[PDB]
């Protein structure tokens, strides 16, 4: 839309009082123009047209419940674009500042939230497996970081690569978290996930297998479902990213921790330099290796704890 930038105020799905970016034209709307080539917010209206209708709303203040997942998918949608910019220097999931678009609503009792390969898709949960997905901000960075994956390394969803793929965004979702500093820990989907159970999540990277997904190469799923193991496999990966971070021991094998940080420009130089479509875990070890070899030398610690954590999981 045209008109004048502004700033208004509303509550998030979890009660939080936040300020956003709108544009006023006569009604005020939720479109961003201070990030690229703007964030666009629309209501997809309980159906699955999309993307529905841009998001207008009258007097600028957010406070119904009704637009709750739409401050968040908003918002969440700014700090993931200024995380990007700021530490990795990449304008949008294109690298030229391309709109980011999210539809909220969608659907009627919706348990998930997906990139669909345009714009972002949250559904707002049945409330009992989920609040509206959009008050997750790991959940929104994950998602928007499948963008840049299919900008970038192209990696296919499926087999070894989809569980790459699915492990990229589960830790760029996690290090979004940990810089907006909202609550950091290291699990995935914990603020909207199951809202009659304290302490869980969907999946968790520091101890994959507390809910069951493999934590070592050797306890792979072999079979055909959820294209191969996208969604379980991708414990074997995580647990790797976060010995690299934090160290700890793992099968007997130790690694020393270089940090968030570190971690984040080594998988972002792997995934932007090294990786393809059809990678599997062990040309990922590859391109992680000659990432930190390119940043901090053959023979930094930091290449030593990157091959360490993947020896640890069994990755060779
Ligand atoms: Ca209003
Ligand atoms: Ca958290
Ligand atoms: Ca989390
Ligand atoms: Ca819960
Ligand atoms: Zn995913």
Not at 80 to 103: E, F, P, Q
Request: hydrophobic share 30%.
């Amino acid at each position: 839309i045209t008109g004048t930038s502004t700033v208004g105020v509303g509550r998030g799905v979890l009660g939080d009082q936040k300020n956003i970016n709108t544009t006023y034209s006569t009604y005020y709307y939720l479109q961003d123009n201070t990030r690229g080539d703007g964030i666009f917010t629309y209501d997809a209206k309980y159906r699955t047209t999309l993307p529905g209708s841009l998001w207008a709303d009258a007097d600028n203040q957010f406070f119904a419940s009704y637009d709750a997942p739409a401050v968040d998918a908003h918002y969440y949608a700014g700090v993931t674009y200024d995380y990007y910019k700021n530490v990795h220097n990449r304008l949008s999931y294109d690298g030229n500042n391309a709109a980011i678009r999210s539809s909220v609503h969608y659907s009627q009792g919706y348990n998930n939230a997906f990139w669909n390969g345009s714009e972002m898709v949250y559904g707002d949960g049945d409330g009992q497996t989920f609040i509206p997905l959009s008050g997750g901000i790991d959940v929104v960075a994950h998602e928007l970081t499948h963008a840049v994956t299919d900008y970038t390394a192209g990696l296919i969803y499926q087999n070894e690569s989809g569980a790459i793929n699915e492990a990229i965004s589960d830790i760029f979702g996690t290090l979004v978290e940990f810089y907006a500093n909202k609550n950091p820990d290291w699990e995935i989907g914990e603020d909207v996930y199951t809202p009659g159970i304290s302490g869980d999540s969907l999946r968790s990277m520091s101890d994959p297998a507390k809910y069951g997904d493999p934590d070592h190469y050797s306890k792979r799923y072999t079979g055909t479902q959820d294209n191969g193991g996208v969604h379980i496999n991708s414990g074997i990966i995580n647990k790797a990213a976060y010995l690299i971070s934090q160290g700890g021991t793992h099968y007997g094998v130790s690694v020393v921790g270089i940090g968030r940080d570190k971690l984040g420009k080594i998988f972002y130089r792997a995934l932007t330099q090294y990786l393809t479509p059809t990678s599997n875990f062990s040309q990922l070890r590859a391109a992680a290796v000659q990432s930190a070899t390119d940043l901090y030398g053959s023979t930094s610690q930091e290449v030593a704890s990157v091959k360490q954590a993947f020896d640890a999981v069994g990755v060779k």
